[PDB]
Structure formats: structure tokens, C-alpha cells
């Protein structure tokens, strides 16, 4: 336990928004951010001293995964691979703290690199919108850089709407204890259309994908309903407030049905507001370090084309 | 004008095991739909009033031209007709428009003895307690039945499954006699087969008049492959967007021959196969011919295994 020695460090930084799949549309759920930096370190520093890096409320340091934010860990120089610096996270806080070790003894004109790949956070980003700014800050110093967020239409097909995404997937390889668990959540009749015998099928089932490793059923599948009330601006990121909805969780207990080849089904009846469901599920065993999974969503009800929308690792 | 308010009635929905085995299948068996329907006396001309039905109901059989047999609601009496019916299948829905029937009689009412179907599309395996409902007016009546379908045929290695999923004849009519559609599964156990065939002949010796053809020049054939350990329906209501359209892998591989045959080769599979086959009737004068369509799967190795289906 040593001294904040974040006054005697500068650096070299750049963020930069990456179009990933370089299709000009920024989105949080494809897209990251980079972060490079070339740090210098005063030579008055000591073993136990510390530096932190904070980032923006738009800026997180993790996916899907909440168990990945491990390529940012201890700072190593990579001409004798010895750790300059060990990496504590509080990312409920925004901020990694990073602990001399005796490198800095040991060493004069001590120079550290980082390139991490960091992600946008869409709580504070519920709609499509220009300039929104992502920054990050080593020690003292603060780099910006903005981008237009522009999220995919919801997917629609006469008066059915939908969307999903998977917002968080943690998978054991080679666990068979534990081989993990995901999250999906659908949003049902987004366009807030008056539908009648309204119904969501989910499966964890595609025919591109024999590989699969999602899996549902009445023994490890788990889900929630929320109502949002009518005009309600649903978070386009997938971010939920569910204290913000009413939970209808109860009023379904009797309108979910388990089928064949990894299907649930849930019956709406007639609607007119907008619904969340929240499908929580257990992954199958995998060897695989990046297993095959997919899981669709689709909204049929009378009068209408069906239309459907899925998630893909 | 929706008089739906102003209809009472009383209804039974059963389930009739119409071959007198002690299983209930929507291939052999059907539902009874009796009610005695109340008017009141302010309902006038061109008022309506609807019957809707359970997704698990549907009001034809093999034969979607069957929908005229749920037709006008008469007075067996008079023989006038009380209400005109128009379905709307696609959203299990009848709606009956009053004619001037209403106006000059009181105290009206209605019956309706009608044979519903099951519809297999949401009920693709044996399940209890699955349940049939129809609507008359605001009042719904249910029934519930345990499904019990089957099991595929199998001889050695080899399994097959067959059925008809629709029938349409024309009697007397020699430009368009009709069509009949029959599903095969081929390798629903999932066997490992070597030089696999699939015969499927229009062709029975004990049925001289069956009407079912099979040849090059009226028959069309799709193939789809199902991924490993996939559940088939087993009410042959096959959901192909969830199958591997294989059809054009097969285009060399389908031979027609001599009695109304038709050979598939599938060499080496161990996957299952739903083989789809739409082909003509032949010209009959009967409105209720004899049509007779087998399915035979061989392999090396094993003894061969048949099936078929009859009307
Ligand atoms: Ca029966």
C-alpha cells in the first residue's frame, strides 16, 4: 500500500471507435473501441506505488462474457516478460488500478504499453444518436473520441415487431460440473401495435447449426416477462431497467409451453404494449474454447406474417 | 352488426376413436362439434356472428376442398337457410351472416353437427391432456385428449414412416382429376445404412382400381435431410424451413419404373429423410375412389421394411 502516483506519469494515447464488421454503422453489440497507450514512469516511483485508469460511463471493459475482462490484466514488459505492474478491476466504478511491483526499483526510465480492445456501454445509450462521446482516463490525463450510434430497425413484418440479443453468455470449456449459462432477451411488439393471438417461440435450434450448445427445456430454462407501459422507449442497446417495467411474470404461469427441438412458446392473446422477455438458460457441454450457439425468437400472430429474430456465437 | 352478444348457446366438443383402437391420433381420428345455437329477436338481416376454433383445430381433414362440408345453417324444417357461412381458415375462424330469415321469424335458433379435425402442426409428440377448443360466439367449449401416435415401422436396421397429407380428388372432372400428396420418413431411427433405396409405388394387387399414379410425367419429388437427433412430427406436419432441402443432390438419383414405381437411392445415410411425393390422380367417377400407395426401404444388410397408406 503505497502512494497514488498517478502525477508522475504521462502518456502517449489514442481511442479509437472500430467499425468492426466496416459496414458505417456504429452499434455497440458489433462494434469496440481500441485503446493504445504508451505510459512513461517517473523514476522517483517505487514498488507499491499505484496508477489507475478510469473510463466513461459510455465505456465498459467487457462483451458478453463478465468473466473476460482478463486481457486487461498485469502490465508485463515484453522484451523480459517481467510484470511491471499488477491489475486490480473495480469495474462497478469504472476504474482498473495498477500496482508497481519492484521492476520499478530495478529499473530506471520505466515505459509501460497497453492495447486493449474495450467495449460502449449502452445503458446511457437507449436510442440511435450522433457525437455521443467515449473517453478514457490514464492517471490525469483524459483521451475523447465520439461516434454516431445507429442501432438496426427493430425487425418487423406487417404489424409484427421484434428484436433480441443475448446479453450475457459465460461458457466452461471442458466443465461438467458447470458447463455455464446465458441470457436473451426478446422485445415483443416494439411498435406497440394492437395484435390478437399473439405467440413467441424461442428454440435454441437452427438448421446451419448442428454444432449448437444452447439448450431449453422445462429442467434448466428460466424465464420473465415485463410489461412496458404504452410509449416507454425500450433501451435499443438491450440495457434493461426492469424496475422501470411492470413484472406480469405471475399471468403467464399458464401460458408457457415446452416443445420439440429446444422450443418454449408463450402465449400473449391479445396486446397492444410492448413486452420483454427475459430467457434464462444453461449451455450444454463443450470442449470448445468459442462453442456454435444459436437462439431464435419469433412473434406470429392473426392477420399477420410471422417474424422472427435470433443471437448467434 | 357483430351480433356475437346476442347468441346463446349450448355445445359439445368430443373426441370420437373413429377406428376403435383405444389411441387417439389426428391421422384416424377426429371431433364431433354439436350445439344448439339461440337468437334473440333483435338480431336482423346481414347481422353476423362467428365460431372460431383452437390452433390445435382445423376444419378439414386431408382434403382442404372439404371446408364446403361447414356450409349455410338451414332450417330443417323449411329448408330456408338462417345464416350463410364464410371460413377463413388461415385464422381459424367461420363467420355466418343472418339472412332476412331473422326478420320474419322469432324465437330463432340454430343447430350445427359438424366433424372437426386435429391439427398436428403444435403437436408434433405424444402428449396428455392436449387440448381442443372451439368458440361460439363469446362461449368456448373444451375437451382434452391424450395424443398417442405410433411408432415408425422397423425390420432389422431399417425404419420407415408414411402418410397422406392431402387428398384432393375431382370426380368427373378430366382436365383436373386432382392431386394427392404422401410424406415418407425414411431412417427415423437414425441407422446406419449402406446402398439405402426407398420404393414408393401407386400399386397394390388386392386394389386393381386404385386411382394413385406415379411416373416421370406427373409425379414431383422433394427430399429433405433432418440434422442428427432432430424429433421429427409424427403427425407427418413437417415444418420445412427447420430441414436441409436436399432435393437437387437427389436430381441423379430417382428412377421411375415399371407399376406405377418410383426408386430413390440414398447410398450411404445415417441421417433421417422426410421425402415428400406430389403426383396425380387418375380419372375417377366415385367421390370416394380407392387410392393405395406403398413405401418400401431397403439396405444391405437387412431385411427390408414396408408401409404405405390407403383411402
Ligand atoms: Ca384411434
Same mark, same amino acid.
Given at each position: 500500500? *503505497? ?9 502517449? +494515447? ?30 522517483? #516511483? ?9 473510463? &466513461?460511463?459510455?465505456?465498459? #471493459? ?15 514488459? %515484453? ?18 488500478? =495498477? +500496482? ?13 504499453? @497497453? ?22 482516463? @490514464? ?9 454516431? @450510434?445507429?442501432? %438496426?430497425?427493430?425487425? $418487423?413484418?406487417?404489424?409484427? &415487431? ?7 453468455? #459465460? ?15 426478446? =422485445? ?5 401495435? *394492437? ?6 417461440? !424461442? ?19 428460466? @424465464? ?8 416507454? !422507449? ?14 406480469? /411474470? ?6 408457457? +409451453? ?28 463443450? +470442449? *470448445?474454447? &468459442? %462453442? ?7 412473434? /406470429? *400472430? ?5 417474424? $422472427? ?5
Amino acid at each position: 500500500g *503505497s502512494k497514488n502516483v498517478n502525477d508522475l506519469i504521462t502518456s502517449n +494515447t489514442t481511442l479509437t471507435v472500430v467499425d468492426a464488421d466496416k459496414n458505417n454503422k456504429i452499434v455497440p453489440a458489433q462494434d469496440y473501441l481500441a485503446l493504445k497507450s504508451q505510459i512513461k514512469v517517473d523514476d522517483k #516511483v517505487k514498488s507499491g506505488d499505484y496508477f489507475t485508469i478510469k473510463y &466513461s460511463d459510455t465505456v465498459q #471493459v467487457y462483451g458478453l462474457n463478465p468473466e473476460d475482462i482478463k486481457n486487461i490484466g498485469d502490465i508485463k514488459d %515484453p522484451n523480459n516478460g517481467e510484470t511491471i505492474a499488477t491489475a486490480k478491476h473495480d469495474t462497478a466504478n469504472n476504474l482498473i488500478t =495498477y +500496482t508497481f511491483t519492484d521492476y520499478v526499483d530495478r529499473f530506471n526510465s520505466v515505459q509501460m504499453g @497497453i492495447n486493449y480492445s474495450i467495449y460502449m456501454d449502452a445503458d446511457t445509450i437507449p436510442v440511435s444518436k450522433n457525437d455521443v462521446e467515449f473517453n478514457v482516463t @490514464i492517471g490525469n490525463d483524459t483521451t475523447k473520441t465520439t461516434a454516431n @450510434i445507429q442501432y %438496426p430497425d427493430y425487425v $418487423s413484418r406487417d404489424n409484427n &415487431s421484434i428484436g433480441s440479443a443475448f446479453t450475457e453468455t #459465460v461458457s466452461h470449456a471442458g466443465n461438467a460440473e458447470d458447463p455455464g449459462y446465458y441470457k436473451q432477451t426478446v =422485445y415483443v411488439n416494439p411498435s406497440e401495435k *394492437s395484435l390478437t393471438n399473439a405467440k413467441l417461440k !424461442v428454440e435454441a435450434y437452427h438448421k446451419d447449426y448442428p454444432d449448437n450448445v444452447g439448450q431449453i427445456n422445462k429442467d434448466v430454462t428460466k @424465464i420473465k416477462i415485463y410489461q412496458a407501459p404504452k410509449d416507454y !422507449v425500450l433501451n435499443k442497446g438491450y440495457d434493461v431497467n426492469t424496475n422501470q417495467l411492470i413484472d406480469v /411474470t405471475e399471468q403467464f404461469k399458464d401460458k408457457i +409451453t415446452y416443445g420439440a427441438n429446444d422450443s418454449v412458446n408463450v402465449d400473449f392473446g391479445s396486446i397492444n404494449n410492448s413486452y420483454v422477455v427475459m430467457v434464462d438458460t444453461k449451455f450444454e457441454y463443450t +470442449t *470448445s474454447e &468459442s %462453442p456454435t450457439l444459436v437462439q431464435m425468437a419469433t412473434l /406470429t *400472430s392473426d392477420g399477420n406474417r410471422s417474424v $422472427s429474430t435470433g443471437n448467434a456465437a
